[PDB]
Design a protein around this ligand. Sequence first.
Ligand SMILES: CCCCCCCCCCCCCC(=O)O[C@H](COC(=O)CCCCCCCCCC)COP(=O)(O)OCC[N+](C)(C)C
Ligand SMILES: CCCCCCCCCCCCCC(=O)O[C@H](COC(=O)CCCCCCCCCC)COP(=O)(O)OCC[N+](C)(C)C
Ligand SMILES: CCCCCCCCCCCCCC(=O)O[C@H](COC(=O)CCCCCCCCCC)COP(=O)(O)OCC[N+](C)(C)C
Ligand SMILES: CCCCCCCCCCCCCC(=O)O[C@H](COC(=O)CCCCCCCCCC)COP(=O)(O)OCC[N+](C)(C)C
Lengths: 57, 84, 52
Amino acid sequence: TAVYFLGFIATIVGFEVIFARYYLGTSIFETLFSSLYLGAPGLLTSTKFLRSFGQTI
Amino acid sequence: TYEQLYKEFHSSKSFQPFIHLDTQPKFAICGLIVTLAVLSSALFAVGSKSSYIKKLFFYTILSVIGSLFAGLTTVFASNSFGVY
Amino acid sequence: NLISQVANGQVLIKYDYPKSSFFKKPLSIACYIFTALMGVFVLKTLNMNVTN
Ligand SMILES: CCCCCCCCCCCCCC(=O)O[C@H](COC(=O)CCCCCCCCCC)COP(=O)(O)OCC[N+](C)(C)C
Ligand SMILES: CCCCCCCCCCCCCC(=O)O[C@H](COC(=O)CCCCCCCCCC)COP(=O)(O)OCC[N+](C)(C)C
Ligand SMILES: CCCCCCCCCCCCCC(=O)O[C@H](COC(=O)CCCCCCCCCC)COP(=O)(O)OCC[N+](C)(C)C
Ligand SMILES: CCCCCCCCCCCCCC(=O)O[C@H](COC(=O)CCCCCCCCCC)COP(=O)(O)OCC[N+](C)(C)C
């Protein structure tokens, strides 16, 4: 479960990069579609990491 | 060019439809019951059988039957409102 | 430039229409319904709990 943690950092950093790239010059629908395609696998992976690690939080 | 088509037009017979237009509002309500029964029993078996293979099996088969009756249901059910 | 009762005429089109494509309309609706049920099957049976 270190690869799941590796899949947990990358989605939060990924949800900051598309906000910065939104701040520079892009329109809305590219931000929103990129947020969907990044949005779903990070949901499944991050949920399974918080379930896996668990008791020491 | 015009004469071959024009003598080929009177040499033919008329057009017989597949199902007459005044019959279709019986098949509409006679389809809408069956597709609700089959599709309702399809989404009903998604509960906790805790057996993955037979649940995918039964759900796929009853979804196939429900789809192929919903198609004919909406085709006959659209010609009796006035949008062909 | 054509007038009411002196240029009425007909127009003739010849075409073909097989028995194959006569039955493709309810199979098109039926394939969209069938590919709509499987999303509810995959979306419904998938783990989203955060506790154990
Ligand atoms: C089903 C439809 C729902 C209807 C809801 C109401 C929709 C209308 C409200 C919009 C109000 C006007 C806002 C506005 O004028 O700006 C719009 C930006 O347009 C927007 O996206 C407004 C975003 C408002 C904040 C959203 C908060 C929700 C949190 C989402 C995670 C223009 O965006 P753009 O100019 O296209 O993007 C360029 C922006 N740069 C910073 C890159 C320059
Ligand atoms: C299980 C059944 C599946 C769903 C059934 C599908 C319903 C069929 C209606 C689809 C949408 C039609 C919308 C519509 O514009 O219809 C109106 C004429 O207006 C009408 O008569 C529409 C009345 C429809 C009543 C709907 C009842 C509620 C159905 C919700 C499930 C006709 O307008 P026009 O499009 O201008 O017709 C002439 C133009 N032609 C190109 C055809 C020459
Ligand atoms: C989710 C629940 C939503 C329910 C919403 C309830 C809305 C109630 C009001 C509906 C408005 C009526 C629509 C309507 O105008 O229908 C009438 C008369 O139509 C008929 O002849 C009845 C045919 C019914 C067929 C059954 C279809 C069931 C599937 C629908 C979901 C059209 O018939 P006519 O106006 O006579 O058009 C003549 C066309 N011929 C081909 C017959 C010549
Ligand atoms: C504004 C709304 C947008 C939300 C987008 C996510 C949508 C999730 C929808 C969840 C559907 C409900 C199912 C569910 O309960 O899952 C939640 C789910 O708990 C959560 O909320 C965590 C979801 C976020 C995952 C973390 C990754 C970060 C997401 C990207 C920003 C976890 O709660 P449970 O694990 O079920 O609680 C304990 C178990 N009981 C048996 C007691 C119920």
